Design an enzyme around this catalytic site. Structure first.
Site, PDB file in Angstrom:
ATOM      1  CG  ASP A  16      -0.208   0.053   2.550  1.00 31.82           C
ATOM      2  OD1 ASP A  16       1.039  -0.017   2.584  1.00 31.82           O
ATOM      3  OD2 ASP A  16      -0.882   0.177   3.590  1.00 31.82           O
ATOM      4  NE  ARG A  30      -2.021   3.356   3.744  1.00 25.75           N
ATOM      5  CZ  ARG A  30      -3.086   2.662   3.345  1.00 25.75           C
ATOM      6  NH1 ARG A  30      -3.380   2.546   2.055  1.00 25.75           N
ATOM      7  NH2 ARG A  30      -3.853   2.059   4.249  1.00 25.75           N
ATOM      8  CG  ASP A  35      -6.939  -0.714   5.284  1.00 31.18           C
ATOM      9  OD1 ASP A  35      -6.095   0.209   5.318  1.00 31.18           O
ATOM     10  OD2 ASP A  35      -8.083  -0.611   5.771  1.00 31.18           O
ATOM     11  CB  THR A  36      -2.159  -4.246   1.236  1.00 32.53           C
ATOM     12  OG1 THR A  36      -1.140  -3.370   1.740  1.00 32.53           O
ATOM     13  CG2 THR A  36      -2.785  -3.630  -0.004  1.00 32.53           C
ATOM     14  CD  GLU A  38       0.606  -2.103   7.156  1.00 28.12           C
ATOM     15  OE1 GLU A  38       1.598  -1.638   7.759  1.00 28.12           O
ATOM     16  OE2 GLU A  38      -0.560  -1.706   7.364  1.00 28.12           O
ATOM     17  NE  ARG A  82       1.714   6.924   5.185  1.00 31.69           N
ATOM     18  CZ  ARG A  82       1.212   5.771   5.612  1.00 31.69           C
ATOM     19  NH1 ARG A  82       1.759   4.622   5.223  1.00 31.69           N
ATOM     20  NH2 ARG A  82       0.158   5.764   6.419  1.00 31.69           N
TER      21      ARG A  82
END
Length: 136
Positions: A16, A30, A35-36, A38, A82
């Protein structure tokens, strides 16, 4: 209306997050609304599908001929500095691609950066219907 702007890949960081050269300035982006799992998660570290999500994002941006960033209508940077945007690789949105493959979940959102929420929601539905990766 939203508009795409050119950027140059510097380095893929996580599923992400990617570092890009934007307007001559190197910066971390970002991916909006997703939402990946992590690999570099502050607590605990690596989650299931984390390496798969990272490799997918990396592969997609590295083999791209043109990288474009699309800021939404709200704030363009988060509290960590970000950039918040939709990233496109040769015209395909990386954010949607991840969700469609069941390698990311549509993040919880309420702030003004929600232009593509519906689009992502539909792809996520399809991914869970097909029981892809996360949705197995």
């Amino acid at each position: 209306k939203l508009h795409k702007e050119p950027a140059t890949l510097i380095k893929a960081i996580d599923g992400d997050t990617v570092k890009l050269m934007y307007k001559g300035q190197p910066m971390t982006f970002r991916l909006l609304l997703v939402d990946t799992p992590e690999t570099k998660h502050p607590k605990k570290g690596v989650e299931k599908y984390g390496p798969e999500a990272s490799a997918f994002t990396k592969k997609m941006v590295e083999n791209a001929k043109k990288i474009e960033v699309e800021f939404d209508k709200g704030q363009r940077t988060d509290k960590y500095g970000r950039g918040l945007a939709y990233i496109y690789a040769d015209g395909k949105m990386v954010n949607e691609a991840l969700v469609r493959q069941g390698l990311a979940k549509v993040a919880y959102v309420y702030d003004p950066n929600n232009t593509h929420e519906q689009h992502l929601r539909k792809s996520e539905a399809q991914a869970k219907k097909e029981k892809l990766n996360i949705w197995s």
